[PDB]
Amino acid sequence: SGVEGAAFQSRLPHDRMTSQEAACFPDIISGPQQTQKVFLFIRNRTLQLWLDNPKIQLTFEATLQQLEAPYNSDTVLVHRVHSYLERHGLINFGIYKRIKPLPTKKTGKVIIIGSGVSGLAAARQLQSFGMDVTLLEARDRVGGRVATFRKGNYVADLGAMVVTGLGGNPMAVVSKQVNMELAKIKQKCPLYEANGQAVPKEKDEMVEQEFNRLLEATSYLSHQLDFNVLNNKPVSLGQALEVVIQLQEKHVKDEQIEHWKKIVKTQEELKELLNKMVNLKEKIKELHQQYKEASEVRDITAEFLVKSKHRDLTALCKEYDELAETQGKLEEKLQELEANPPSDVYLSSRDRQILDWHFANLEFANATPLSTLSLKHWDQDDDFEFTGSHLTVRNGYSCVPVALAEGLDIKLNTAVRQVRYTASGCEVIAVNTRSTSQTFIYKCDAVLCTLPLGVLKQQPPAVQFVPPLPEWKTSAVQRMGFGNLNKVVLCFDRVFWDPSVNLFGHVGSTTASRGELFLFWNLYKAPILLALVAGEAAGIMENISDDVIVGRCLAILKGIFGSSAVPQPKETVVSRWRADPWARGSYSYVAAGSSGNDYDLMAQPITPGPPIPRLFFAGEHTIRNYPATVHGALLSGLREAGRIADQFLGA
Ligand SMILES: Cc1cc2nc3c(=O)[nH]c(=O)nc-3n(C[C@H](O)[C@H](O)[C@H](O)COP(=O)(O)OP(=O)(O)OC[C@H]3O[C@@H](n4cnc5c(N)ncnc54)[C@H](O)[C@@H]3O)c2cc1C
Numbered sequence: 254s255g256v257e258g259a260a261f262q263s264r265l266p267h268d269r270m271t272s273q274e275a276a277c278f279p280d281i282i283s284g285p286q287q288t289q290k291v292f293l294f295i296r297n298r299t300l301q302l303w304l305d306n307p308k309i310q311l312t313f314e315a316t317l318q319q320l321e322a323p324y325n326s327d328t329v330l331v332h333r334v335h336s337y338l339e340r341h342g343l344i345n346f347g348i349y350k351r352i353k354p355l356p357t358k359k360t361g362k363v364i365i366i367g368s369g370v371s372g373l374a375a376a377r378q379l380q381s382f383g384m385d386v387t388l389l390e391a392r393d394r395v396g397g398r399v400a401t402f403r404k405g406n407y408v409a410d411l412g413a414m415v416v417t418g419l420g421g422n423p424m425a426v427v428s429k430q431v432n433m434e435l436a437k438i439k440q441k442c443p444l445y446e447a448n449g450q451a452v453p454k455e456k457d458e459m460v461e462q463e464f465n466r467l468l469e470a471t472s473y474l475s476h477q478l479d480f481n482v483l484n485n486k487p488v489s490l491g492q493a494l495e496v497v498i499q500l501q502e503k504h505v506k507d508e509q510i511e512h513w514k515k516i517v518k519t520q521e522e523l524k525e526l527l528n529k530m531v532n533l534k535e536k537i538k539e540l541h542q543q544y545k546e547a548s549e550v551r552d553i554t555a556e557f558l559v560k561s562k563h564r565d566l567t568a569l570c571k572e573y574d575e576l577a578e579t580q581g582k583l584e585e586k587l588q589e590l591e592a593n594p595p596s597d598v599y600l601s602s603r604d605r606q607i608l609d610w611h612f613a614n615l616e617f618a619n620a621t622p623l624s625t626l627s628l629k630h631w632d633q634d635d636d637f638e639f640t641g642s643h644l645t646v647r648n649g650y651s652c653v654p655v656a657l658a659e660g661l662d663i664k665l666n667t668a669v670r671q672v673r674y675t676a677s678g679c680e681v682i683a684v685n686t687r688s689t690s691q692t693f694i695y696k697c698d699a700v701l702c703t704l705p706l707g708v709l710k711q712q713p714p715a716v717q718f719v720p721p722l723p724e725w726k727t728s729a730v731q732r733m734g735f736g737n738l739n740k741v742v743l744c745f746d747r748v749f750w751d752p753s754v755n756l757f758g759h760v761g762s763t764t765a766s767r768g769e770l771f772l773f774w775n776l777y778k779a780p781i782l783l784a785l786v787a788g789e790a791a792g793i794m795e796n797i798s799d800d801v802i803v804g805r806c807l808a809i810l811k812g813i814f815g816s817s818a819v820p821q822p823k824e825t826v827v828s829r830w831r832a833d834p835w836a837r838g839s840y841s842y843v844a845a846g847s848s849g850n851d852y853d854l855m856a857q858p859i860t861p862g863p864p865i866p867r868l869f870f871a872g873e874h875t876i877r878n879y880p881a882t883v884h885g886a887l888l889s890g891l892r893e894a895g896r897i898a899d900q901f902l903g904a
Pocket residue numbers: 366367368369370371372389390391392395396397398399411412413414415416417667668669670703704705708715716738739740828830834835836838839840871872873874880881882883884886
């Protein structure tokens with residue numbers, strides 16, 4: 254609906270106050286119900302005004318003038334609701350034209366570490382709020398793990414490239430603000446085996462159905478039967494899958510055994526039956542010799558003898574023909590059995606390879622081998638997935654952080670090395686990545702750390718904290734997963750693939766290598782193919798040079814399309830996200846032995862000892878309900894900007 258749709262697009266229930274709103278409006282939530290409904294209407298209506306035109310700042314004044322009677326009479330409540338929505342980044346976020354220009358007097362100094370989407374989104378908010386913000390970025394570009402290759406007409410993303418559903422997604426708004434072209438991903442994903450032969454549609458569907466069954470069985474084991482600890486070790490999804498596959502093979506073999514037993518028993522009965530017929534034919538042969546001697550010789554005792562032999566001899570053929578139809582009733586039962594054997598195997602060798610492709614796909618979506626994922630919590634965020642098809646960014650995802658950086662004070666080539674925070678202020682120490690001799694010392698009242706989890710995990714530490722971070726924070730950093738995923742960009746001068754197909758799979762020959770170049774993406778205006786390296790393959794392939802890995806790509810493509818069809822690429826690009834010192838991997842995952850609560854602990858600010866919080870955290874690894882995505886990075890920056898403004902400017 255209308256105001257209903259605005260709540261939904263803001264990830265809020267249209268008919269209930271959230272717990273956060275109850276915190277900020279206790280007089281409302283404890284007061285009469287009719288005022289609760291007035292509150293919800295004003296909140297939903299204000300969200301609608303913003304979402305229907307997110308290119309323009311929505312002021313309190315303009316909200317008041319577009320509210321209908323009688324809501325435009327409660328000026329104070331409107332202001333309370335508008336101020337709340339703005340402070341937390343539900344309206345007036347991203348890039349939009351200001352109506353009310355910024356104050357020249359800044360209040361409070363914030364240093365933001367890192368200039369990815371979470372740092373940029375927080376910076377824009379803090380600046381909007383009238384604070385003095387500087388971002389320090391170690392790279393020579395903004396965007397972090399949004400990273401687009403651009404040369405001539407060639408565009409290709411080496412970082413994020415997928416926008417998940419638009420329903421509920423804040424990137425829907427940013428996409429409008431930036432005029433980013435999104436294209437829905439077409440569903441057809443043909444698979445080719447290592448010999449290049451396409452997988453028949455029926456077998457692709459059979460195997461995909463098994464994959465879904467296996468996953469559901471792991472989820473039942475985990476949540477209904479509490480199979481989550483394995484000899485005092487947290488069980489991984491990988492471990493669980495392989496056990497469920499093991500039981501399926503065990504069940505196939507048992508049904509084979511029960512079938513071979515039915516065969517053997519039927520064969521035994523057929524054997525004894527023939528034996529019984531042998532003895533009965535020998536009995537008729539013997540008796541028929543006595544019909545011949547009796548017929549040979551006629552008085553009444555001899556004639557009677559013929560009638561008695563003839564009567565018994567027909568009776569013995571009556572016995573024999575009885576056994577004959579029991580013989581047929583068996584033989585047809587035997588024939589039927591050895592014509593309809595149950596499954597010989599659970600998964601043929603080729604079937605298991607195709608199944609391993611779907612596991613590779615799952616290792617792509619989590620950026621890690623399945624043996625590292627928490628069985629219980631790997632999909633702990635699935636209640637928050639957006640509705641709609643997934644899309645890709647046709648003109649390159651870097652358009653978003655480039656536009657978010659407009660008007661911000663950003664120091665590139667500036668690597669933070671130490672972060673000192675005391676009950677009286679903060680100092681950030683950074684070195685210039687071009688003259689390591691050159692050192693800078695930025696004073697500020699608060700630090701917003703958007704360092705990637707991979708950087709926080711680094712040992713020896715890349716960034717030193719003074720005082721060191723609390724044990725409860727370092728432990729969460731150690732527990733949480735940080736994955737890896739890489740891409741090969743192949744730029745050609747002609748299209749030799751199916752232009753109507755966005756995706757196609759290469760089925761690898763072994764389990765261990767299932768993530769090697771398993772998925773190819775056709776996304777761009779120029780003749781460009783992207784190949785993914787996922788799972789165990791991702792980290793290992795970083796040690797292979799660009800040339801050898803491109804060769805392996807071309808071998809795969811020549812296997813699908815033909816030697817003569819695949820030219821040499823004009824240009825190639827190969828990501829190495831784990832080796833990248835400013836990322837150390839691609840995105841977080843819920844590791845066995847972690848949980849969603851570690852994402853909440855990562856977001857918790859640090860307060861210096863004997864006081865107010867000085868050190869704050871954002872980034873994809875700090876947002877429990879939306880981890881490992883661009884929108885999660887964004888929402889985490891909006892959240893921290895609100896928390897920081899509440900602290901230093903007042904709610
Ligand atoms: C290969 C790949 C594929 C992905 N695919 C999916 C997808 O398609 N869609 C999706 O939504 N998400 C995807 N993601 C994840 C998504 O890109 C990230 O979750 C998000 O971009 C992370 O943003 P962030 O602000 O948390 O961190 P980052 O973007 O990493 O920003 C942190 C910043 O800190 C900087 N920095 C590091 N060390 C220092 C230092 N010492 N001093 C100063 N600055 C420093 C970094 O250079 C960086 O700019 C993908 C990521 C990768 C790498």
